[model samples]
Target: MSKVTYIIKASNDVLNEKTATILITIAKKDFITAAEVREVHPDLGNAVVNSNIGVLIKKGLVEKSGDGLIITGEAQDIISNAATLYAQENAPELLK
Candidate 1:
């Protein structure tokens, strides 16, 4: 099926909602650092964000590079497809 559907199915199996949101946030950025993630999700705090990043890295969805935390191609695919599906479902009127 579509990547959006596949992402949903796979995430349900492997990722919690918090992890999925963190992945999407990182996927949307070009040069996001761990500090930036903490800034956006202050409720989670640095420790939790770092923990989530560790989880993502372990899952191969993100990488810690010199530039910063980089989202993997698989994560990007999931984010893009989810955005497309969201627009299709929620922005059809606006699309026209």
Candidate 2:
């Protein structure tokens, strides 16, 4: 008998959820370039970040125009609360 493990892919909705979460993290700080995220979560391909950004933009959790990507005004409060929670849990100054 042979045993095989199946890998599950992140669905579009799951990707969007992750994107919204990441965007909140992005907003808590001054600003971080997409490249920075690539550097940090090297396990995740750049395409993943791109997809996340795309979903975030469509949902209005994030915005991108002539300048660059940014969290939406409506997301500020939620992101702020998340930031505080994340800082308390993670204990990372780079984030807090």
Candidate 3:
């Protein structure tokens, strides 16, 4: 299971665990705000989450839609897989 996570890790050089988590948070709904992202990931401060979102913007993975954020269609599958990897890594019991 961990190896599966590693596969997703190596598939994209740009995504480390943290960025992948952020991307999944942004994709949680049709529209999400920076503050909302922080809510899901309280370990990251407001500034940290906002700046992380900035990097995602530059990577062409996420974009601003009015006041919310949306991940690109192409990146959706990548994020979906990452979300699974996240749960597998953090909460393996969920998989059972």
Candidate 4:
């Protein structure tokens, strides 16, 4: 595949992984819940949010609090980089 296509795929993976973590952080700071984050990102599905949260937890980037989730220091750094890189790249948008 072309470089742009590769980048697009990478972006999808990064966004899928990091966005949920960041949203969870925002939720904790705002006293919201996972359902709230999913509501906010209605364009995204529940499975994605659940799976991403699981990955973050496994990677030690997130922790479970009661029934909610919290981002760790490592998660913050990763999400920051992911968001910044996603914003910086100018790859063609993918539509499904």
Tell me how candidate 2 scores on lDDT. 0.50
Each prediction's RMSD to truth: 4.5, 9.6, 3.9, 7.3
Candidate 1, pairs of clashing residues: none
Which candidate comes out best when scored by TM-score? 1
Ranking by TM-score: 1, 3, 2, 4
**Over all chains combined, what TM-score does candidate 2 have?**
0.54
Per-model tally of clashing residue pairs: 0, 0, 0, 0
lDDT of each: 0.67, 0.50, 0.67, 0.51
lDDT of 4 by residue, 31-91 (tens): 4456565666644467776665566567665676746667677655655554445555643
Give the runs in model 3 whose Cα sits over 4 Å from its true position: 1-11, 84-96
Please identify model 4 stretches exceeding 4 Å from their true place.
Answer: 1-31, 86-96
Cα lDDT, model 2, residue 74 = 52
TM-score of each: 0.71, 0.54, 0.68, 0.51
Instruction: Estimate, for each residue in 48-95, the C-alpha lDDT of model 3 and write its tens digit.
Output: 677777788897778778688888874676766655666777666786
| Per-residue alpha-carbon lDDT of candidate 1 for residues 12-62, written as tens digits (9 for 90 to 100) | 545555566666667677668777777898455567677776788898888
Q: Between candidates 1 and 2, which one is better according to TM-score?
A: 1
Stretch of 10 with least lDDT, candidate 4: 1-10
Per-residue error for 44 in candidate 4, Å, reads 1.7
